[PDB]
């Protein structure tokens, strides 16, 4: 029973980075060569595992976290990184095992007059713990005077829209990102990679 990797990578819509979508892959036989050999997925980078040995290993589960971010913000998707996305939207641990695949989706995620459907969090009371998700849209009190949860001066909505347009440099163009996180719990290894 082959895995849905192509169903995750070729999905028509990706989630906002603040609400990054996680899929569990288990009870399957995996094939990472198709992931590795496909041309457009150039931004390939794994930590604690090499792309060459992925077939030999087996894991209890494999998680696929998918989202859309800016091109220059892709560098923040790695162990030990800090920044907007690393702090408030999607944090990976320093001991992260599994890896991140990103590609430019300007052809399909960008829209003339801006794509405001992709949002990210830029204000939070504290950094995210690794693999934490925060979907709260409550108005963030940055000022001293509380504003009772309604937008106003010195209290804003914590989510910012990306506004992707077909133009702009590679840095500001949308990048669809998929993070394959491997897991071992001493349970039966339900995903092998022959």
């Amino acid at each position, epitope marked *: 029973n082959l895995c849905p990797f192509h169903e995750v990578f070729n999905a028509t819509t990706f989630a906002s980075v603040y609400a990054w979508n996680r899929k569990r892959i288990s009870n399957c036989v995996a094939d990472y060569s198709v992931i590795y050999n496909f041309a457009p997925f150039f931004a390939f980078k794994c930590y604690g595992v090499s792309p060459t040995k992925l077939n030999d290993l087996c894991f209890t589960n494999v998680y696929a976290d998918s989202f859309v971010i800016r091109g*220059n913000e892709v560098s923040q998707i790695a162990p030990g990184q*800090t*920044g*907007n996305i*690393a*702090d*408030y939207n999607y944090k990976l641990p320093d001991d992260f095992t599994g890896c991140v695949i990103a590609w430019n989706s300007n052809k399909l995620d960008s829209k003339p007059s801006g794509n405001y459907n992709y949002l990210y969090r*830029f*204000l*939070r*009371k*504290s*950094k995210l713990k690794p693999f934490e998700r925060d979907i709260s849209t409550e108005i*963030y*009190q*940055v*000022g*001293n*005077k509380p504003c009772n949860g309604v937008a106003g001066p*010195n209290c*804003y909505s914590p989510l*910012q829209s990306y*506004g992707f*347009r077909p*133009t*702009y*440099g590679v*840095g*500001h163009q949308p990048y669809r990102v998929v993070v394959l996180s491997f897991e071992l719990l001493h349970a039966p290894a339900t995903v092998c990679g022959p």
Partner: antibody
Amino acid sequence: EVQVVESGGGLIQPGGSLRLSCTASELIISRNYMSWVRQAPGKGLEWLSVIYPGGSSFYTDSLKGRFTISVDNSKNTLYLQMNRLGVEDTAIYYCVRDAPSESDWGQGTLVTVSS
Amino acid sequence: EIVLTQSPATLSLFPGERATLSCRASQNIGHFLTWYQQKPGQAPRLLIYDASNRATGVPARFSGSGSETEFTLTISSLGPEDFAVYYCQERSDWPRGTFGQGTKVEIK
């Protein structure tokens, strides 16, 4: 109107160190994007460093090692430790709060490095 | 590194005239650019953010336009108080970014 007040300027010898302080009244510095921007006399502005609401801090390449931004949550103030200052570090240092639609600057404090 | 070249270095106009100021970037920074007003001997003041949006409290005569590599700031009618130094700052890595050299406004 939002007011941010800087402090800790003045004279210092070359190669010395200084720590500027910045405080705000109507906002919480701990929960804001607070950046330090200097304006050399008769020269253009230069963004030096920022500290995020979560505590992440970033610096320009030319300043790496010599500057260290920080915050003390209890006092509601922002600090900029400055070390190994040269004659070119003389400038008026602004404590600026950044928001998506607002950018609130303080009046600044002159920092002079001379003998 | 992104370097912004503002032009003209000095813009000499009479009161009531329309002032058009240009900022040009070395790289495609999209719409991420900010315009700052600075009276002499005072801290800068936010005019335009995202290269087109007018900041709260700014009078309607100020407006921004342009994108990618060629940005422009327009004052529809110069009042006496509009005579100042205007800085363009790119915000590709907001709140980080480089500043332009600025453009003073003076006639007499």
